[PDB]
């Protein structure tokens, strides 16, 4: 009866995630003063992580507690699809946030003429569409199924819900859902750092016009940098673990694999906690 304490702790992290993220989606839902562009992208993100803490983590918690899948073959397949989708969405939205920042620094003039709230919403949508095109369909067309015996044994078993995939899909899937979006997000976040240096060097050389709209686009950068940093700190561990497994399945422990996965799962709780930093959000949290 170690199952009772486990159910406890997991219901706690479920609390942190669901409460935090609904708080974010409802705060930006109320204060129009808060409905900035970057805040709307943070909404996309909060909806992904909400889904994680609402389904991905509860159902994934039964499986860890009970050693087996108690919801049958189809719900297994689907639940996996939703985990995958949530991560793909998170990382594509972070990528987009970095790009948005770079533009809203390098071409401030052009930026306010073109980018609006409605264009932000179209963008978030298209992101979720790509996310679901790239993640959701490969699973449902079975492109992920492995030839090996024990694999099929798991497909045949409704209590077997382990993501056992062929190696071409391990590679192409992890590149497309994760490594591409990551790389673009990092290179762009760095080009953004260097712009926000040369700018804060030459703050002297700016009309109280540019020095004030960029004074507003600039603050809330440190937060975004923290968000991105931390995300990388969970999901890169998991995905590297995942790519080594293709070279040699005996090189990674099965519980390390489960650990680094629950690392990235916990990331969906960290984001709300990282918002307690900003006085704009901190006051809105009380
Ligand atoms: C318990 C499970 C395993 C269901 N959780 C999935 C994991 O959190 C995220 O896994 C992935 C996300 C995006 C792209 C991926 C991926 C695994 C592979 C492979 N080959 N390509």
Curated annotation (Swiss-Prot):
Q: From the Swiss-Prot or TrEMBL record, state where the protein is found.
A: Cell membrane; Early endosome
Question: What is an annotated GO biological process for this record, any one?
Answer: regulation of circadian sleep/wake cycle, sleep
The top of its lineage is: Eukaryota, Metazoa, Chordata, Craniata, Vertebrata
**Which family, according to UniProt?**
Belongs to the G-protein coupled receptor 1 family. Adrenergic receptor subfamily. ADRB1 sub-subfamily.
| Membrane topology note | Multi-pass membrane protein
A Gene Ontology term for the protein's cellular component: plasma membrane
The record describes its post-translational modification as: Homologous desensitization of the receptor is mediated by its phosphorylation by beta-adrenergic receptor kinase.
For the keyword Membrane, the answer is: yes
Under the GO molecular function aspect, what terms does this record hold?
A: beta1-adrenergic receptor activity; identical protein binding
Residues included from the entire protein: 39 to 354 of 483
Instruction: Indicate what this protein is called per its UniProt record.
Output: Beta-1 adrenergic receptor
Q: Which UniProt keywords apply?
A: Cell membrane, Disulfide bond, Endosome, G-protein coupled receptor, Glycoprotein, Lipoprotein, Membrane, Palmitate, Phosphoprotein, Receptor, Transducer, Transmembrane, Transmembrane helix
């Amino acid at each position: 009866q170690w199952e009772a304490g486990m159910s406890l702790l997991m219901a706690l992290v479920v609390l942190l995630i669901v409460a935090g993220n609904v708080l974010v989606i409802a705060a930006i839902g109320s204060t129009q003063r808060l409905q900035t562009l970057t805040n709307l992208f943070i909404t996309s993100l909060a909806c992904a992580d909400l889904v994680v803490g609402l389904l991905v983590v509860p159902f994934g918690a039964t499986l860890v507690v009970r050693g087996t899948w108690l919801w049958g073959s189809f719900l297994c397949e689907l639940w996996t699809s939703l985990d995958v989708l949530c991560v793909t969405a998170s990382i594509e939205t972070l990528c987009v946030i970095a790009i948005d920042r770079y533009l809203a620094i390098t071409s401030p003039f052009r930026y306010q003429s073109l980018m609006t709230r409605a264009r932000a919403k179209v963008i978030i949508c298209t992101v979720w569409a790509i996310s679901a095109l790239v993640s959701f369909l490969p699973i449902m067309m079975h492109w992920w199924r492995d030839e090996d015996p024990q694999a099929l044994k798991c497909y045949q078993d409704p209590g077997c819900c382990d993501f056992v995939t062929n190696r071409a899909y391990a590679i192409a899937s992890s590149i497309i859902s994760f490594y591409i979006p990551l790389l673009i997000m990092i290179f762009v976040a760095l080009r953004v750092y260097r712009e926000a240096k040369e700018q804060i060097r030459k703050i002297d050389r700016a009309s109280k016009r540019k020095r004030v709209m960029l004074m507003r686009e600039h603050k809330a950068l440190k937060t975004l940098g923290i968000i991105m940093g931390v995300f990388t700190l969970c999901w890169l561990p998991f995905f590297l673990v995942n790519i080594v497994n293709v070279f040699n399945r005996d090189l990674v422990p099965d519980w390390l694999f489960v650990a680094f996965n629950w690392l990235g799962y916990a990331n969906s709780a960290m984001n709300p906690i990282i918002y307690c930093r900003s006085p704009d959000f901190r006051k809105a949290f009380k």
